[PDB]
């Protein structure tokens, strides 16, 4: 919200096992304080990449944690925002879905 | 090369049918005066996108367009680059395989 926002990602759903790599456009983040949130009801994990990951201050490329159930046999929707560490503030959320791989 | 460079892509093949989604993260570009220029012998085509696809002058969203032939039985390696129309400034080329499809 107000400074976080997320422009357009590569894609909005994905395996519930983690791994896939997603772009992340978005305005002005600073690469040292910057973070990928993954959020659901009793589940939180974060996109891993690093500060190289960040691209001119405006991209993130990471990969998506694995979500908390591996053996999932049908869509959980989940909350994908950035977060900034310092002050937990967080971009507007983007539905994603974790898939049975 | 200089002015114009690939930094990073969200994926190097796609179907020879073209229209694949393409995260190119680049160095600064000027949106009306950008082109993504994929060259093979006798043949270039280019990526499909608005000005609006040019994300803060580093990244660009846009559709593969078909290669030259839908016929294709074996992937083809074609070049893909970066092209500033006004002064015809080349990046350096970045493999891109299209598929059979």
């Known amino acids: 919200t107000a ?3 997320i422009c357009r990602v590569n894609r909005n759903s994905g ?3 983690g791994g896939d790599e997603i772009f ?3 305005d002005k983040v600073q690469k040292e304080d910057i973070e990928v949130y993954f959020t659901g ?3 939180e ?4 990449f690093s500060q ?3 691209h001119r201050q405006v991209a993130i490329v990471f990969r ?3 979500y908390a159930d591996p053996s999932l046999q049908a869509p959980v929707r989940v909350s994908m925002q950035l977060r900034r560490p310092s002050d937990r503030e967080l971009s507007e959320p983007m539905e994603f879905q974790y898939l049975p791989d």
């Open 45 to 48: 994990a974060r996109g891993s």
């Open 24 to 26: 992340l456009l978005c």
């Open 64 to 66: 998506t944690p694995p």
């Open 41 to 43: 009801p009793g589940w």
């Open 3 to 5: 400074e976080l926002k």
């Open 52 to 54: 190289a990951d960040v």
């Open 15 to 17: 395996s519930c096992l």
